Structure formats: C-alpha cells, structure tokens
C-alpha cells in the first residue's frame, strides 16, 4: 500500500490518493431453500429424559413456522 495526500492552500481542499476500487456494479441472485416437515399433533405420555427436550424444540419449530406463515406473501 502507498497512500499519499496533497493539500491545496488556494482552495482549502485535500486529495487522498493511492486507493483501489471494489465497486458493486450489479447483483447475483440465488434461491436458498430449507425443506420443512408438516407434522400431526400426536402425543406421548413419556418420558424420563430426552423426549421432553425434543418436544420443547418441536414446539419452538411450530412457533417458527407460524411466524413465517404470518409474514403473508
């Protein structure tokens, strides 16, 4: 890198040179998909462990789908 500067007493201005461009000229569109599963409201009376953590995450999953559906079109 070689950044240089010049001040002009006559016009009260300064020019900072030695920079390189990276201008956004256009766009690149890509469809990003997430495969979701429609699940029935079935239940189990279990459990000592693990499934109780899995049902909470499954209820959080349903809440996420509900909010995304609420976003309309």
């Amino acid at each position: 890198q070689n950044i240089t500067e010049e001040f002009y007493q006559s016009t009260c201005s300064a020019v900072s040179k030695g920079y390189l461009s990276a201008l956004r000229t256009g766009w690149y569109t890509s469809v990003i998909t997430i495969e979701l599963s429609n699940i029935k409201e079935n239940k189990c009376n279990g459990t000592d462990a693990k499934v109780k953590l899995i049902k909470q995450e499954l209820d959080k999953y349903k809440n996420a789908v509900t909010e995304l559906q609420l976003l309309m079109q």
């Binding site: 890198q1 070689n2 009260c12 300064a14 461009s21 766009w27 469809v31 459990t47 953590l53």
Partner: protein, 380 residues
C-alpha cells in the same frame, strides 16, 4: 454536499423479481424436484431465468428419521446418545432466520451466518460466473460482502421455505481511487459580517471507471479497508475524467468546478486520510497538539493543514478531533487563497448549487450593469 443530484433506484428489484416468479403454481415443484439428492442445482424457471438453487438445511428428511420410527407405535418413547443435539443445532438456525425476517419484515441486511454460512457463501463465490481476481476479493472480505448483501423472504409453500440472497457483483476492481476533502475558505478581515466565504461542493470519493470517473457524493456510502474502497454504484454520478483537474487548477477551461458561496465564517475541521484541514475564523481557538507534549501549533485565521506525522489531536473551539494515524506521505501545495481574488462589494453571497464560471458570469453581469449605469448618471 451534492447527494441531492443522485438518481433513485430500487435496491431489491432484482431479488423481488426472482421471488415473484417462485409464487407461480408449478415453479415451487421444479425447485423441490431438482434437489432430490443434490444440494446445489441450477433450476431454469418457466419465464426463462437461470438461478442457482441451494438446499442449505434439510429438516424434513431429519424429522422423517426421528418422528416416523419414534412415534411408533402405541406411544412416544425415549431417545439415545447425542443425536437429539443434532436437532437443537439444526432448529436453532431456523429460529434465528425467523427472528431476523420477523423484525426486518422479510428483507434483511447484512446477511447473517444463520441466513448463509461462511462455507455456503464461499461455495457460491466459487460457482459464480466471475473472474479469479473478484473471487479472491470476496473470499478475503466476506464481512463487507455480507454488509453489501440482501436476503428477501419469498415463499412458504409447504414442504419448502424459499428466500432469495442478493449478492454483490464487483465489476470494477483495482482501478485508482481518491477521496476529496473540502472545508470553507473565507476572508480574514477584521470587521464581523464583512467577510465572504467559498467552499468546493464536489467533496467525496472518486474512482476511475470505464473512461469516466464514478463520483460518490456521500463518502459514508463507501467503506475503506485501508487500501481498498468498497463502494456502491447506485449512490454515484458518472463524471468526465477532467473532474480531477479542479484539484490542480480550479479555473481550468476543460471542467467547470463546483463551488458554494456564503458569508457564514464559522470555524470547523475536516479530518483527512493523512492529516487535518483547519478552517479558523473569528475569535475561535484553533490548535494542533501531540498528546505526549501538549500544544505544538496554534492556527492563525484562515484555512490551514497539519500532517498526521507528530500530530495526534486537532482542537477547533470546544471540539477535539483525533487525527487518523494511517501511515502515508503528505504534501502542502502553497498557493494564494482564491477568495482574495474576488471583490466583496460585487460577490454572490447566497449560492448553494453554483460553479466557478457561474459566479464569474454573475459578477460580469453585476460589474457591467454597475459601470454602464455609473456612466449614464455621469452625463448629468
């Protein structure tokens, strides 16, 4: 100053155009069918557009291997190992994507790691139909790429969640760039209110682009990486190459340099890349100091400059400015302040969108209709 001269585009017009096509009856099916086993497929839509489709997270096939074998048969039963964890990390991404789209009403910027991971982002860059120089530029500055990116939520047709990621295309790379810093230039004469000011409105970022110069009036729209300037062409004007001539010669016949005239002789400072421009006017205390030894220079009335070499701070009135400590070479180009060349008696004191010749034309019109009217009354 000249940001009002800019046009007005639609940032997400390209992304929404893809969303609108995906809303069609058989368009969702084509996307889902092509991504049967492969996670990357270039799906050609009904209208004719070629888009690279990505399957980032598979929650359906994961649920189908932990709901169908589980649920069976009489009632739900227990889970083993760290496998359940796999669900907590997979579902977390969906929850974060949802939270982002909820607060930002379907359009997010910058594009988060949850929306598109570094591994997925770097994969798209390598698959993009662009030069190797552009690929290395994007790969080394992912955070800037993400900042200049958009994510638009399109459809939630069942069994799939689709959203368009609008990525930047850097068509202009490695071309020389320069930043112009301007501050008001006023007369120093003692009586208050008798002083006239001049300011170059043409400040901002300038980059050489296809035989012309891309001018960015709002320097905030550009991002500096200490060597590389990341700009957006949407916030630019296409000016001829002759615009740079204004720096070496303001009265040049090739390009008509843009100026602003006033009587407001207010003190201020413009912190440059390698120093500071100080516009000292009136009873203001303008000073330049080194933190270790205190005050090193006291500015007199007018417009002056100090290099970042040995100067840590600049004080203009009650405002303390920290000078940028970027390593470089500064040069003080000595010259008579132009404002001294103009007669204050005949000077346009209220111009916002004027030029160096527009002021001359305004003076010529004034000076002629003053002398001709003087000679008219002289024959009494």
């Amino acid at each position: 100053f000249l940001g009002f001269l800019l046009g007005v585009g639609s940032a997400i017009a390209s992304g929404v155009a893809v969303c609108k096509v995906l809303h069609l009856e058989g368009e969702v099916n084509k996307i889902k069918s092509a991504l049967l086993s492969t996670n990357k497929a270039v799906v050609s839509l009904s209208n004719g557009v070629s888009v690279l489709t990505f399957k980032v997270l598979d929650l359906k096939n994961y649920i189908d291997k932990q709901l169908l074998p589980i649920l069976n048969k009489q009632s739900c039963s227990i889970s083993n190992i760290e496998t359940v964890i796999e669900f907590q990390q997979k579902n977390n991404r969906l929850l974060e994507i949802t939270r982002e789209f909820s607060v930002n009403a379907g359009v997010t910027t910058p594009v988060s790691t949850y929306m598109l991971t570094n591994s997925e982002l770097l994969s798209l860059i390598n698959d993009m139909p662009i030069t190797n120089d552009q690929k290395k530029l994007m790969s080394n500055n992912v955070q800037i790429v993400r900042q200049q990116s958009y994510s638009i939520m399109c459809i939630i047709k069942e069994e799939v969640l689709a959203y368009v990621v609008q990525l930047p295309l850097y068509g202009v790379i490695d071309t020389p760039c320069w930043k112009l810093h301007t501050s008001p230039l006023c007369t120093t004469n003692t009586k208050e209110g008798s002083n006239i000011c001049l300011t170059r409105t043409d400040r901002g970022w300038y980059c050489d682009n296809a035989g012309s110069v891309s001018f960015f009036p709002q320097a905030e729209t550009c991002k500096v990486q200490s060597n590389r300037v990341f700009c957006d062409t949407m916030n630019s004007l296409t000016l001829p190459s002759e615009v740079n001539l204004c720096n070496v010669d303001i009265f040049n016949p090739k390009y008509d340099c843009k100026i602003m005239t006033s009587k407001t002789d207010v003190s201020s400072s413009v912190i440059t890349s390698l120093g500071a421009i100080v516009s000292c006017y009136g009873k203001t205390k303008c000073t330049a100091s080194n933190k270790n030894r205190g005050i090193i220079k006291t500015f007199s009335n007018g417009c002056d400059y100090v290099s970042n070499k040995g100067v840590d701070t600049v004080s203009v009135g009650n405002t303390l400015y920290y000078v940028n400590k970027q390593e470089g070479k500064s040069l003080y180009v000595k010259g008579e302040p132009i404002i001294n060349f103009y007669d204050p008696l005949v000077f346009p004191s209220d111009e916002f969108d004027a030029s160096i010749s527009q002021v001359n034309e305004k003076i010529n019109q004034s000076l002629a209709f003053i002398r001709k009217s003087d000679e008219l009354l002289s024959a009494i």
